[PDB]
Every structure is written in C-alpha cells, then in structure tokens.
Structure 1
Amino acid sequence: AQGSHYKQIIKNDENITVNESVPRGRILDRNGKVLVDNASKMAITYTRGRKTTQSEMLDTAEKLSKLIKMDTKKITERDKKDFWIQLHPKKAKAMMTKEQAMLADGSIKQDQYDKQLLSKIRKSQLDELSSKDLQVLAIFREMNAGTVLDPQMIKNEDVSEKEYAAVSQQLSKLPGVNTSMDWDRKYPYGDTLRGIFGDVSTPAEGIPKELTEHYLSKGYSRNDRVGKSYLEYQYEDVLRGKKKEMKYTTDKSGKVTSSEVLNPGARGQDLKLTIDIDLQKEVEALLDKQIKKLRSQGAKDMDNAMMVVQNPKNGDILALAGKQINKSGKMTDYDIGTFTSQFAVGSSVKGGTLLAGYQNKAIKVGETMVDEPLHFQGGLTKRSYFNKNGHVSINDKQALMHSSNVYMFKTALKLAGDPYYSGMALPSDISSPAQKLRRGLNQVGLGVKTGIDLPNETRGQIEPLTNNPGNYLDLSIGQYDTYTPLQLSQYVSTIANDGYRIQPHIGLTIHESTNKDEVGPLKKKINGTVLNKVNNTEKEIKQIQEGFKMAFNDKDGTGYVSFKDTVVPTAGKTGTAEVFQEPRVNSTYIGYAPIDDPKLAFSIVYTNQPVPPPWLTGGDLGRDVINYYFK
C-alpha cells in the first residue's frame, strides 16, 4: 500500500509534471523486529515576519493551541517566568515599585531591571500550571525560537489522511502557519542503534549540499530526500522508494485533457540486519553497568568505551558502544566509533605478531627462548612483570599467557635478521622487517579495512617505519599503529575460524516491499565473504588459540580475573597501552566462545583509564555478555 506525498510540481507549457514521494523500506533485526519504519506526519511551522510583535505571536499561539496539543517539558524556568510577566504585567509591576521609579531615574538600565524581576518569582509559577497556559507557552516558545525569514517547526506528529483534510486550511489561515504532509522515519527502540541507522535528508534539505555530485550522478533531483548517514546512506539503493511520476497535459483553461504515468512508484525494499535487537540492548546495558562498575575506582577520565560482538564464522554483527565525557560521567552514544575511531591497543595484537613471525621463518612453532631485560646503547626494554631480574625459559603459548613483551621483542629482532645480544645497536633500517610484520598483521585484519557494509571505516594510523626501530618493536607489541575495535573483532574471529578472515556485515538479507507483511520474500542474502586465509599452517594457527585458551583458562594468564571460567569456555587475549591524555592508559580485550566450535567473538576498548594493571577489570563486560548469549 504505497503512500502518496506530492513532492514536486513543474509547469512547462500545457504540460504539468507531478512527483510523489513513497515510503522507504523498513530496517529490521535478525529476527524481524521492526527497527525503522515510516510514519505519515503533518508538519506545522511558523514563519515570523520582519516586523512581527510579541503580542502578535502570543495571539496566533493562542488560536494555535485550540487546534493541536503540545508536549510540555521543553519549557524552561525562564520560559515560564517570561510568560508570566507577559501574562501578568499588572501583577509583576507591583513587585518592582522602586525599580520602575529608578528606571526613569536612569539609576538602572532595563538589562538589570529585567534580572530582579526574574529573581522575585515562585508560587506564581503555578498560577499557570493551568495546563491551558503551558500549552500556549509550548507553541509560543518555538515561534520565537529561530531565524526571521525561516519557517519554524512547532509540531511534527502522526496524521491521518482525513485529519490533514479537516485542519490544514484552518491552520494555514493563521498568519505564519503552513502545513505539509511528510514521510518520517519512526524508531520503536527509541535511542537504540540510532547512530548506526543514520538519517534521511529533511524535506527542507534537498539532496544534502555536500552530497550533490554523489546523488545527482546517480539520477536524483536536488529535491529528493535521500539517506545521508550510515545505514540509510549505505543501503539507499535498496531502502529508497522509487517515486510516483505523472505528466498531465492541459487546456489553456487549466483542464487536464490527458495524463500519462512515467512511474507508478515503488515502496522501498526492506533490509534485515544481523543485529539481535535484544542482545544489542543488553550489551548497551552491560556497558553502562561496567563503565562505572568501578564507581570511578580511578577511571573518571576514561573518555571512550567500545564493544563489538560478532559471529566469527559468518561475520554477522551484533555490536555497539558509547563514550564518557567525565567532566560528569554523563555519557553519549559513540555507536559508530567501533569502526570509525583509531586507538592504540597494545598487547592484544600479540597473536598476529607470532603469525607474522611464523610465516617469515623468524621463529618456529613451539619456540622456547628465554627472556629478561633487554639492553642497547641507551634504550632499555624491560617487560613489565619482571624488569630487573628473574630470567625465565618461555614458549610461544606462555608468552601469550603472560603477555610477555620481550618474547615479541625477540621475535621482532629475529624477523629483522638481527637476533638479540646485550648491548647491540638497534638495527638502523627496519623498512623490510616492518613490512613483513605489517603484512602479517594485515592478514588477520590489523591495519587494513575490515570491509564492513557501512561508510567511514578507517584502517588506522600508519606512520613511516624505516629508521626508528623502537617504533618497530612498539609495533610488535601494539604501541605504534592505531587499530579499530572492529579490526580487533575481525582479528580474533579469524583465529577462531582456523585462519579465515571474513568480511563483517550488519546487513543480513534483503526482501521485497510490503506495507503489511513483516516477512516479504527474499531478494538478496548478504554474505560474510571470505577475504583470505592467513599464510600459516593449522599447527601454527592452533598454537595462537592454544595460547589464547591459556590466557583465559590458566592462572597467571592475564585474563583469569575476568574470564577464569564461565558458562562456556572462552579463549582470548588482553592489552594495556601507554598513551598521553597527561599520562593515562588504554585497556583492551579480545576473545571468542566456545573453544570447540566458536559462535561468538568480541573486542573491547576502554580509552584513557588511569591504571597500572594490577588494578582494573574491564573485560568482566566480556564475561557478562558471553554468559547472557549462551545460556
């Protein structure tokens, strides 16, 4: 049942052509819950003239009230205090007897008279909780809330076809008031995923200005409403309603002699997402719990927290996040930062390095070498769980259990053809190893786009790596190149997939149009495409995941405190990263579950925690979310 809003009427000669918008297709979750739908809405606006008074507007506002209801609480204290002085000038004067007298002294200007008039107001605020009053104030404030020639929205609410028929003319009679029918996205899960859904351009907006070339080259008219961010933008091609076009031929007189249909119109196609709306809501809830499930232990300048959850075998996405500006602890939605923002993630990249170190014949599978502080001409890398002494024979799994920097430092040196000896100079051209290393990490999704079906993905900050070898070893340890939370997810995921990097997607399937049927027959499956397989043997592969188990299933394994065991076995790796806000830390967690046939994977990023890490426990987020899913 495709709807009909007149969008564009052009007169040529005796021809008049008419275009009607039709509803876009819906966005639904992996189970069919409507996430984005459509609503027919009337929009009533005021357009305040050059010389239009306050008595002018309060009057229109009054007639406007006996005609539509408003929601109160946009009203401020000042709105009410001003409205009161506006409504009760006789009553208000009496409180300012001295000041009205000293207004004509010249003792005071109005600008300080008006401020004491506001100071003496209280029980008279209730003198207009006469809800009839607040209604008028509701409308009136918007009529004063804006630019002169610009029209101003007063109400955009659901309207029927007959409703608009009865009231539009009698709204339009009032000076400044216009009405229009509009298509508007409606969002049952309110604020959930809204960033990811993106918006469609307003009727005021054409095609958005900076997007002209973009939409004009694909055939649009500048008047067309289009998707302009994220999901509405990304799947504009399928979500869009192909508009109705009619060409009328006319008499001289105006009489339509003939009519032809250029396009009857097509209600947009419905898009299903990989997202389980419930899981989504739960994760946002757990993330808000966990963020101060520290009561700010110290973390009151943690400024971002990120979570991505995914099916590591088909790249389905079930995942969101949000930031924390704790000049408060008052959070916003940083939904998209999961694949649009770049963070130093530190030690959680260590599995990729070993893989890099395997395929270049730099270390071998099971390699057992020893570790201890390192010494160069100045430069002094101690790993940080023994910096001074205590020299331990350690293999590649164990190095991941402990998250031992010096093992990764030693492999890095071996990858440079320059194995460690105390007092060696740092190899001065590290171009070649750095390249071998990066291509290693690139294979599991680190430093390359994941390919996700959404706009604005970043691959991370990638600075020259030629003759600062310290940055080279930083890289082997996650303290040079910045990565993305989605990249981290793609990376564990390929480990759990026995080496298959898969292109993540929040797109699930594409169906055909209906106004009713919350199915709609299938048109397109959106597949999690295999991108490549790691250049490594199963044994090389298995070793990283054996290591990953015993960082979560073993004891000094740096993920026991959060993952020790829970309702299903979980393998992973973690990360603490030095950065400068003033000095602070980044905390990172990646994992997957269950070990024997994985079905979930996730990445976690907390930014700018104050913490040295024998105190902080963020991947309890990981533990809690994984419990919910599997039970």
Structure 2
Amino acid sequence: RNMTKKEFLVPTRGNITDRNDEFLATNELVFGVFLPSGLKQKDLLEKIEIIQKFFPNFSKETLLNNYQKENSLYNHNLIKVVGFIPYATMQPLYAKLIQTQGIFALPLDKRYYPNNALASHVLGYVGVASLQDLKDDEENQYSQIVGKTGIEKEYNKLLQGKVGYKIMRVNALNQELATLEVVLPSTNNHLQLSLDKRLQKEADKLFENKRGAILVMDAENGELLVAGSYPEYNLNDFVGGISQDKWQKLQDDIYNPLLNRFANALYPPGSVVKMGVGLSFLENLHITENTTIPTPPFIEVGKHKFRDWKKTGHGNSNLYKAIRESVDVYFYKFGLEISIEKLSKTLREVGFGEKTGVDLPNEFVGIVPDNLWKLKRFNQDWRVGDTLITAIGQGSFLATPLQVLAYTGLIATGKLATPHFAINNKQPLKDPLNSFQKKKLQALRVGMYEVCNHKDGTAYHSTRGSKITLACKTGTAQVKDMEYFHRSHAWITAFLPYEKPKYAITILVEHGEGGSKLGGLLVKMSNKLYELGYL
C-alpha cells in the first residue's frame, strides 16, 4: 500500500497588455533563501550567521525577526528568510548556497509595472493576501498574491488563474514514483486592455503640472484609449509591501495621489450639461431650437437676481447660440417653465444619475438633484432657484469625468457607450433615446460645432491649430488675482471628427480656472490621434 504525496501546480500571474501588446504589468523572476521549519534554536543561529555572510547588508537580528513572522510559503515545510533577491545578486551566491546541506534558494515571482506610474489608476496593484482576502476567495491561498486596486482587482480571478495539482506515489525516502493523478493548471491568464501606451504618455505630458483627469473613448463600442488621473502614483512602490516612508509621502501629499479622479471623484459639471438641459426643453415645452429670446446680463425672479457669467450679456439668442456662447439666461428663463421632475428625467436619461458601468471597482454614481432628493437629504423645499442653478450644472449637481464622457458620446453618436478597459469585454451599446430626441441631437451637435468653430464660440481663440474638425462644450465649476485652491475647476468635453463622430474626449483640470483655457490641451490630444492614424 505505502502512502501518497500531493503537490500543487500554481500558475504564474497573467500579464496585462496594452492595445498593441506593449507590457503594462508583468512578473520578474527573483529569488528567496529558505530554511526548514521546526529547527533547534542553537542550529538556527549558526545558519543565520551563514546567511549573514551572503547578505552583509542585513543585520543578524533583522533575520531572526523574519524567521517567525506572518510570511512563509505554500509548502508543508519551508520558511522564507531572505526574500526578493535580484537574479543578478544571486549570480555569485547560488553555488555557495548549494554547498551548505540545510539551506535552500528558490525561485519566486514579484509583480512588475514597467512604466511605473503610467495609468496607475487603471492598472492598480497586487499585494499580500489579507486574512479577509483568503476568506473572500478561498483560492487566493496558493499564491498569496491578490489584486488590491483597479484592474488587478477587478480581473483578479482571470489574472490569477486556476491551480492544478499532482498526486504521486512515494517511498520512505520520500522520493517520487508513479504519478497517480494530474490535474493541469489554467494557462491563458493574460489580459489585453484598450489603452494605447503612446496616447497615455501624451496624456501624462499634458497634465504635467496639473491635477485632474483625462479620457479618450471610442464612441462606437466604449473602449478607453486614455484614462489619466493626476497625480498618478508609482505602482512598483507597493509590490513588496509599501514602506512607512512612501506611504506618508502619498497620504500627506495634499494633491491626493491615491484618488481616482475619473471614476471615484465628484465635481459640478457646469455648463457641459447645457445640451442635455436644452434637449429637455425641446422635449417638454412648446418651443424649438430656433426659438429666440432676449438675453440680458441677468434676470430677476423674486427676491434674487440670477446672473450670467459675463457682465455684458448676450443680446438675442436661440438654442444654437446659447450652447455656442455658454449663455446662462436662456436656461434660466426656460428653467422657470420646466418642472424639475421632467428636466431631471432627461439629464438622468443621458447618463448623469448612474454608473457608466466601467470595469473597475466602486464606480461613483452622481447626484442629479431633484425635488425628492433635496427633501431626503436636507428636508427643505424645492424652490424655483434650485431648478435654475441646476439647469446650468451647479448647486447640488455632481458628476464623474466618466459620466461626462459617456454623455458626450451619446450626443455625438445617438447611442450610449459603456466605457471599459478590457478589450475582450463586448459591451453592447445602449439606446436610451426616443425618436424625437435623436432628431434634435443634430441641433445640439451643431451648437457644439459652433463652440469650437464659430468666431463667437467660447472655445474659438483656444482650439485653433487642430488638424481635424472638432465639436466641444466648455464648463466651469465653483468650489488672475485668485489664490490656487479658491479657483474654479475647468471642464471641456468634445467629439471628433465633427463630420462623422467616432471618438470622444473629456478633460478636467482641478482649479483650471475656466473651461475655455483647456482648448490648448484638447487640440494636442486630437492631433496625437491624427499623428498616429486613428483618424
């Protein structure tokens, strides 16, 4: 009869690849010096002295501490004394370690992010299985390597793969005889993302001294070619546990590097909502895109005056012109005549209430403020003033850069893309619009066209020098003489090319102090897509 013996076959964690098969995330073969468990205190000391010689850069006692610790292996035996040893460091040591009978040196994997802080908020990082992680998915135990944030986390099961095992007949000498059973481990554990590494490096360059977020998206299927959040952080600093020094540096950086700003940060959309608001007017009222009304510097309604962004005012203006010139009063006036229940329905239909459905963990839904919402949070009534400030994307209105992006690609396309990173995530388009609404879209596009291309357009002086025709909408959100943190945030979203929309771009600079000021960044990205043949 005798007895048998089991051995797990643990697959290497899958690679993460760029659109064009560049490496974003991979593994590095490194070493580890191990001693057997359950050893005499006298002997253990003499072996640590031996291991001190080979690594004089570690202290005789820091190696005690490593012995009994919360580390270890997947095996019925062996304890890791020194870990993370570079291959090159092992080069003169391997043979010397082999000469000593009870000392083992074994190959280990260490995750590696070649580009460091590139797309750090997309890729995320892996860490040591928490005792709660082992509970979550029992199979996290064989590697003790699990995704903590972003894609590494969202696609952990895939990237990690499935263990196999191999059961074998053995003799007393505990040597291998017949294989009695084999179950093989999974193999194709790799993952391809839609990002383009060149386009993201451009994105980083553009936000070089700036905080905020930037997004490029194929508006026909929802692929994200760019997703920057600034500051990014260097994923490699987490791999072997984070140091007390670097954790302080990240936590106490006031610009908040750990914040994912395209999916886990909320900002007032500002004027960018205006074509969604206009679409509601046309739908619910008895008016048209050509309905022209007088647009003074401000209006009065009761006790208070609702002011337009520039002193001078904007003469007579229709829908096309109100979009073009980011005019406030057109929306103030028709906002008087629209119920917040119907406006909010249209805004929520164009994707501001809910998650876009991005393949990351914990996407934020916004707040499309309405009657019932103000009651549940503040217990205060819905005054007309609330309808009005909301009709220009401010007050209690919050969205994510993702929401604005999906929204912008709905306008341009007529259908709603689910943004995603995993190329093999076939996300069908969604059709949340009726007949009437789709027809009115062109009107809205022409407006966006005019923002960038008509000389009156808010974004004319800034978006010139573009190799393709652009269509945009600017925004500004309240929080030259103004100190940095008091400054309004800056939006600009846009689709391209105008003549047949395919891509959408959405940019947000924290304290960017005005939406038009971001046209110089939009062109540079739209040109990079031209330069690289996407257009």
**What is the Cα deviation at residue 489 of structure 1?**
1.0
Q: Which residue of 2 aligns with 1:89?
A: none
Match of 1:628 among 525, 528, 531: 528
| 1:455/1:146 CA distance change after superposition, 3 Å | farther
Normalised by the length of structure 2, the TM-score is 0.78
Q: Which residue of 2 aligns with 1:157?
A: 86
What's the secondary structure of 1:442's corresponding residue?
Answer: helix
Match of 1:195 among 116, 121, 131: 121
| 1:591/1:171 CA distance change after superposition, 3 Å | farther
Structure-1 separation of matches of 2:517 and 2:21 = 36
2:287 matched to 1:368? Answer: no
Structure-1 separation of matches of 2:517 and 2:65 = 48
Match of 2:136 among 207, 214, 218: 214
Structure-2 separation of matches of 1:409 and 1:436 = 16
CA contact (8 A) 2:48 2:63 kept: no
The 5 A counterparts of 1:137-148 are: 137=57, 139-140=58-59, 143=62
Partner AA of 1:593 in structure 2: L
Q: Which residue of 1 aligns with 2:382?
A: 468
Q: Which residue of 2 aligns with 1:606?
A: 509
2:473 matched to 1:567? Answer: no
Cα deviation 1:354-404 (Å, max 9, x = unaligned): 1222222364232222233222332210112137xx572210010011111
**What is the Cα deviation at residue 168 of structure 1?**
5.1
What's the secondary structure of 2:330's corresponding residue?
Answer: helix
Structure-2 separation of matches of 1:60 and 1:346 = 67
Match of 1:500 among 405, 409, 415: 415
2:30 matched to 1:41? Answer: yes
Match of 1:400 among 304, 323, 336: 323
Q: Which residue of 2 aligns with 1:316?
A: 223
Partner AA of 1:379 in structure 2: H
**What is the Cα deviation at residue 153 of structure 1?**
5.8
**What is the Cα deviation at residue 573 of structure 1?**
0.4
What's the secondary structure of 1:587's corresponding residue?
Answer: strand
Q: Which residue of 1 aligns with 2:238?
A: none
| 1:503/1:285 CA distance change after superposition, 3 Å | same
2:345 matched to 1:439? Answer: yes
Question: Share of identical aligned residues, percent?
Answer: 23
RMSD between superposed Cα atoms in Å: 4.0
What's the secondary structure of 2:305's corresponding residue?
Answer: coil
Match of 2:392 among 477, 481, 491: 477
> Which has the greater radius of gyration?
1
Partner AA of 2:137 in structure 1: Y
Q: Which residue of 2 aligns with 1:557?
A: 457
Structure-2 separation of matches of 1:19 and 1:26 = 21
What's the secondary structure of 2:288's corresponding residue?
Answer: coil
Structure-2 separation of matches of 1:286 and 1:171 = 56
2:312 matched to 1:409? Answer: no
Q: Which residue of 2 aligns with 1:531?
A: 430
What's the secondary structure of 1:457's corresponding residue?
Answer: coil
Match of 1:286 among 206, 219, 225: 206
2:518 matched to 1:618? Answer: yes
CA contact (8 A) 2:367 2:398 kept: yes
Match of 2:270 among 341, 346, 364: 346
| 1:410/1:173 CA distance change after superposition, 3 Å | farther
| 1:266/1:391 CA distance change after superposition, 3 Å | closer
Cα deviation 1:496-530 (Å, max 9, x = unaligned): 11x20111111113xxxxxxxxxxxxxxxx32421
Q: Which residue of 1 aligns with 2:151?
A: 231
Q: Which moved more, 1:322-331 or 1:35-44?
A: 322-331
Cα deviation 1:462-516 (Å, max 9, x = unaligned): 551452333332222111221111111111111111x20111111113xxxxxxx
**What is the Cα deviation at residue 326 of structure 1?**
13
Q: Which moved more, 1:568-577 or 1:439-448?
A: 439-448
CA contact (8 A) 1:24 1:268 kept: no
CA contact (8 A) 1:272 1:507 kept: yes
CA contact (8 A) 1:230 1:455 kept: yes
Structure-1 separation of matches of 2:173 and 2:34 = 33
Partner AA of 2:164 in structure 1: K
CA contact (8 A) 1:345 1:587 kept: no
What's the secondary structure of 1:337's corresponding residue?
Answer: coil
Structure-1 separation of matches of 2:64 and 2:522 = 46
Cα deviation 1:536-586 (Å, max 9, x = unaligned): 444310011110011111223111132145211110101111119974311
Match of 1:490 among 388, 402, 406: 406
Q: Which residue of 2 aligns with 1:355?
A: 279
Structure-1 separation of matches of 2:345 and 2:496 = 27
- Paired positions, count: 483
What's the secondary structure of 1:572's corresponding residue?
Answer: strand
Structure-1 separation of matches of 2:361 and 2:215 = 17
Unaligned runs of 5+ in 2: 36-40, 72-80, 232-248, 376-380
2:53 matched to 1:63? Answer: yes
| 1:327/1:242 CA distance change after superposition, 3 Å | closer
| 1:171/1:234 CA distance change after superposition, 3 Å | farther
CA contact (8 A) 1:345 1:576 kept: yes
Cα deviation 1:272-325 (Å, max 9, x = unaligned): 211111111111112216x3xxxxxxxxxxxx3111111122211011324359
The 5 A counterparts of 1:556-595 are: 556-564=456-464, 566-579=466-479, 583-595=486-498
What's the secondary structure of 1:624's corresponding residue?
Answer: helix
| 1:238/1:148 CA distance change after superposition, 3 Å | closer
Partner AA of 2:114 in structure 1: P
Cα deviation 1:88-143 (Å, max 9, x = unaligned): xxxxxxxxxxxxxxxxxxxxxxxxxxxxxxxxxxxxxxxxxxxxxxxx55x45994
Match of 1:270 among 173, 190, 204: 190
Partner AA of 2:261 in structure 1: G
Q: Which residue of 1 aligns with 2:166?
A: 246
Structure-1 separation of matches of 2:219 and 2:278 = 20
Structure-2 separation of matches of 1:546 and 1:474 = 25
| 1:566/1:443 CA distance change after superposition, 3 Å | same
Unaligned runs of 5+ in 1: 1-12, 66-135, 292-303, 417-432, 510-525
CA contact (8 A) 2:8 2:165 kept: yes
**What is the Cα deviation at residue 237 of structure 1?**
3.5
